[PDB]
C-alpha cells in the first residue's frame, strides 16, 4: 500500500530492505521471472546487457550489501551467476519475496491530484491491474534501451551478415568459426572481443575514439580498493593522476603501441575501461584493432583507413539509453538532457516520487543505493524532510554546473558522482 517499488534488481532489493526495516509497507514489482536485475539474465539466456563471460569488475566486498557479505568462497570478481545467486539469497534472508510481484511489468505511473500515484501493471496473463499507492520508488535501472550509432555506416542495408547490439549478444560460441567486428571500447566492447577471441576465427575491434584501458588491478589491489585507501585519498587530484599515469606505463606501456588510438583526455577525465585481457589478446593476434567502419560491402566491412575484412557479424557495443516508458512526462530533465534530481534522487516537483540507482560512480554502486534507500525510507514515513522546490532546484543547478565544468557535455554525465563525497552526506 504505502510504497510501490519498480524493479527488484540490486537497487530495488535495497529499497525493499530499507522500507522493511522501518515497518513501511510496500510491494515491489518486477518484470522478470526472478530478482537480480541484469545479473540473472545471462544464465537464463535472456537478452540483456550482460553476457555469459561477464564478471564483476569491482571487488566483492565493496559490491555486496554491507550487512550481507557474499560467500567467503567467492573470488574477488564473481561471475554473473554467482552475483545473481547472491542477490536472490539476500532477498530470501531479508524476507522480501512476499512483497515481490514477479512477472509483473509496470505499464504506467501517474500522479493523482490528491497526492497518491495510480500505477497500472500487467501480469503474466497480460491482464492489467490499476492500483493506487502512496509513494513510488523507481529502481528500474538505466541500461534499458540499446543505443546504436546515429548513422549506421553506408551500405548496412545490403550487408550479407548480421548486425547486432551487445544486448543481443550472449556467448560467442554462437560465433564459432566466424569472423566478427566489435564496435566500441567500453566495458562491453573489450569483454565481448576478448570472449570472441577464443571462439571466432577472426575478431576485429573497431575503435574511433580512444579510451584509457586500465587493468582491473594495480599493485595487486583493485582499482576500487585503491580509491578507498587512505594514502590515495591523501594525494592531490594531480598527484593521483600522476601516480596512475606512471603505474599504467609500467603495467602495460602506451596505448598507441597496441594499435589503439590515444585518448584526447587524461586518465581520470572521461570513462576508463577495465580489462585484464584486451591488450594481451591484441599482442597474441587474437584481436585485431581497427579504426571506424566506413561502409558495408556485402560480406565485407570497409574501415576509414581503406582496409577491409570479410565479416559474418558486427556487434555494436555502443551502450544504452536511459528511458522510463512508464513515466508519461519522463524522468525530470533540464532540456539539455541533464537529469534534474535533488541529491540525485528526488524530483523537485513531484512529491512522493523517488529514483534510486540512477547514479554513476567510480566503482560499485552498492553503498550509494544503500544510503539512498535508507534516506528514501525516512522521507517516506516523515522522519526526514526536503527543501522547498526552489532550494532543491538550487542544489540541482549547482551540481550540473560542476558537471559541465568537469566532464563538459557528453552523455550520461548528469548522473556521475564521486562515491566518497556523495556517501559523506548520508
Ligand X SMILES: Cc1cc2nc3c(=O)[nH]c(=O)nc-3n(C[C@H](O)[C@H](O)[C@H](O)COP(=O)(O)OP(=O)(O)OC[C@H]3O[C@@H](n4cnc5c(N)ncnc54)[C@H](O)[C@@H]3O)c2cc1C
249 touches which of a copy of itself, ligand X, none (CB within 5 to 8 A by kind)? a copy of itself
Q: Is 257 in the site for a copy of itself (CB under 8 A)?
A: yes
Q: What is the x/- site pattern for ligand X, positions 144-183, by CB under 6 A?
A: ----------------------------------------
What nine digits make up the cell of 262? 590515444
Half-sphere exposure of residue 95, counting CA atoms within 13 Å on the CB side? Answer: 7
Distances from the Cα of 222 to the Cα of 116, 185, 206, angstroms: 45, 20, 28
What nine digits make up the cell of 122? 500487467
DSSP 298: B
Q: Quick one: which H or E segment has residue 301?
A: strand 300-303
Task: Please identify, using beta-carbon distances, which residue of 166 and 197 lies nearer to ligand X.
Answer: 166
The SS3 call for residue 346 is: strand
Query: Sign of the CA dihedral 290, 292, 297, 299?
Result: positive
Contacts of a copy of itself in 44-63 (CB under 8 A): 55
Q: How many residues interact with a copy of itself (rule CB under 8 A)?
A: 31
Q: DSSP string of 130-151?
A: EEEESEEEE---S--EE---SS
96 touches which of ligand X, a copy of itself, none (CB within 5 to 8 A by kind)? none
Q: Is 364 in the site for ligand X (CB under 6 A)?
A: yes
**Taking the complex as a whole, how short is the minimal distance between the CB of residue 250 and a copy of itself, in angstroms?**
5
Cβ within 8 Å of residue 264, ≥6 positions away? 209, 210
Q: DSSP string of 59-94?
A: -HHHHSBTTBPPPTTS-SS-BHHHHHHHHHHHHHHT
Count other C-beta atoms under 10 Å from residue 384's C-beta. Answer: 12
106 touches which of a copy of itself, ligand X, none (CB within 5 to 8 A by kind)? ligand X
d(CA 264, CA 341): 31
Q: Is 20 in the site for a copy of itself (CB under 8 A)?
A: no
Tell me the binding residues for FAD: 11, 30, 38-39, 57-58, 106, 365
The CA-based angle 131-378-391, given to 5 degrees, is: 95
Judged by CB under 8 A, the residue of 219, 298, 334, 420 near a copy of itself is: 219
Q: Check if the beta carbon of residue 108 is closer than 8 Å to that of residue 117.
A: no
Judged by CB under 8 A, the residue of 26, 51, 74, 303 near a copy of itself is: 74
Tell me the binding residues: 11, 30, 38-39, 55, 57-58, 106, 143, 185, 187-188, 208-209, 320, 360, 365
Task: Please identify, using beta-carbon distances, which residue of 71 and 325 lies nearer to a copy of itself.
Answer: 71
Q: What is the x/- site pattern for ligand X, positions 308-327, by CB under 6 A?
A: ------------------x-
Q: Is 105 in the site for ligand X (CB under 6 A)?
A: yes
166 touches which of a copy of itself, ligand X, none (CB within 5 to 8 A by kind)? none
Judged by CB under 6 A, the residue of 50, 161, 332, 347 near ligand X is: 50
Contacts of a copy of itself in 79-98 (CB under 8 A): 79, 82
Judged by CB under 6 A, the residue of 3, 19, 26, 63 near ligand X is: 63
Q: What is the x/- site pattern for ligand X, positions 11-30, by CB under 6 A?
A: xx----------------xx
Query: Sign of the CA dihedral 274, 190, 139, 10?
Result: negative
**Whose CA is closest to 64, among 47, 86, 79?**
86
Distances from the Cα of 195 to the Cα of 234, 278, 301, angstroms: 38, 10, 21
Q: Check if the beta carbon of residue 180 is closer than 8 Å to that of residue 315.
A: yes
Q: Is 49 in the site for ligand X (CB under 6 A)?
A: yes
φ, ψ dihedrals at 300, nearest 5°: -125, 145
198 touches which of ligand X, a copy of itself, none (CB within 5 to 8 A by kind)? a copy of itself
Binding-site ranges for ligand X (CB under 6 A): 6-12, 29-32, 37-39, 49-50, 56-58, 63, 105-106, 139-141, 143, 187-188, 326, 357, 364-365
| Contact residues: a copy of itself, CB under 8 A | 55, 74-79, 82, 198, 216-221, 247, 249-254, 257-258, 276-277, 280, 282-285
Amino acid at each position: 500500500m504505502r510504497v510501490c517499488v519498480i524493479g527488484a534488481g540490486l537497487s530495488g532489493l535495497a529499497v525493499g530492505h530499507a522500507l522493511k526495516e522501518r515497518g513501511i509497507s510496500f510491494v515491489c514489482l518486477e518484470k522478470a521471472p526472478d530478482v537480480g536485475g541484469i545479473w540473472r539474465q545471462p544464465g537464463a539466456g535472456e537478452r540483456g546487457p550482460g553476457y555469459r563471460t561477464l564478471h564483476l569488475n569491482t571487488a566483492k566486498q565493496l559490491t555486496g550489501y554491507a550487512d550481507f557479505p557474499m560467500p567467503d568462497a567467492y573470488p574477488l570478481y564473481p561471475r554473473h551467476s554467482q552475483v545473481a545467486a547472491y542477490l536472490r539469497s539476500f532477498a530470501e534472508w531479508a524476507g522480501l519475496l512476499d512483497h515481490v510481484e514477479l512477472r509483473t511489468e509496470v505499464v504506467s505511473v501517474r500522479q493523482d491530484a490528491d497526492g497518491p500515484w495510480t500505477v497500472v501493471s500487467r501480469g503474466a496473463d497480460g491482464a492489467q491491474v490499476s492500483r493506487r499507492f502512496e509513494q513510488v520508488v523507481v529502481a528500474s535501472g538505466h541500461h534499458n534501451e540499446p543505443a546504436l550509432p546515429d548513422p549506421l555506416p553506408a551500405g548496412a542495408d545490403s550487408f550479407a551478415g548480421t548486425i547486432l547490439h551487445s544486448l543481443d549478444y550472449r556467448d560467442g560460441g554462437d560465433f564459432a568459426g566466424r569472423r566478427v567486428v566489435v564496435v566500441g571500447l567500453g566495458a562491453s566492447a573489450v569483454d565481448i572481443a576478448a570472449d570472441l577471441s577464443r571462439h571466432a576465427e577472426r575478431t576485429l575491434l573497431s575503435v574511433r575514439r580512444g579510451l584509457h584501458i586500465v587493468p582491473k588491478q594495480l599493485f595487486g589491489m583493485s582499482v576500487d580498493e585503491i580509491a578507498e585507501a587512505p594514502w590515495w585519498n591523501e594525494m592531490s587530484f594531480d598527484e593521483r593522476r600522476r601516480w596512475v599515469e606512471q603505474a599504467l606505463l609500467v603495467a602495460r606501456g602506451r596505448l598507441s603501441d597496441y594499435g589503439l588510438p590515444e585518448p584526447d583526455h587524461p586518465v581520470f577525465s572521461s570513462a576508463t575501461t577495465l580489462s585484464d585481457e584486451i591488450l594481451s589478446r591484441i599482442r597474441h593476434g587474437a584481436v585485431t584493432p581497427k579504426p571506424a567502419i566506413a561502409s558495408f560491402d556485402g560480406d565485407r566491412v570497409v574501415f576509414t583507413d581503406g582496409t577491409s575484412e570479410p565479416a559474418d557479424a558486427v556487434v555494436y557495443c555502443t551502450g544504452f539509453h536511459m528511458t522510463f516508458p512508464f513515466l508519461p512526462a519522463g524522468c525530470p530533465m533540464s532540456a539539455d538532457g541533464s537529469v534534474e534530481l535533488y541529491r540525485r534522487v528526488v524530483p523537485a516537483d513531484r512529491p512522493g516520487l523517488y529514483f534510486v540507482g540512477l547514479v554513476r560512480p567510480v566503482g560499485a554502486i552498492t553503498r550509494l543505493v544503500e544510503a539512498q534507500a535508507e534516506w528514501v525510507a525516512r522521507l517516506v514515513d516523515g522522519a526526514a524532510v526536503l527543501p522547498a522546490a526552489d532550494q532543491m532546484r538550487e542544489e540541482i543547478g549547482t551540481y550540473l554546473t560542476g558537471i559541465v565544468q568537469r566532464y563538459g557535455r557528453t552523455e550520461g554525465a548528469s548522473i556521475q558522482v564521486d562515491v566518497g563525497p556523495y556517501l559523506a552526506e548520508f
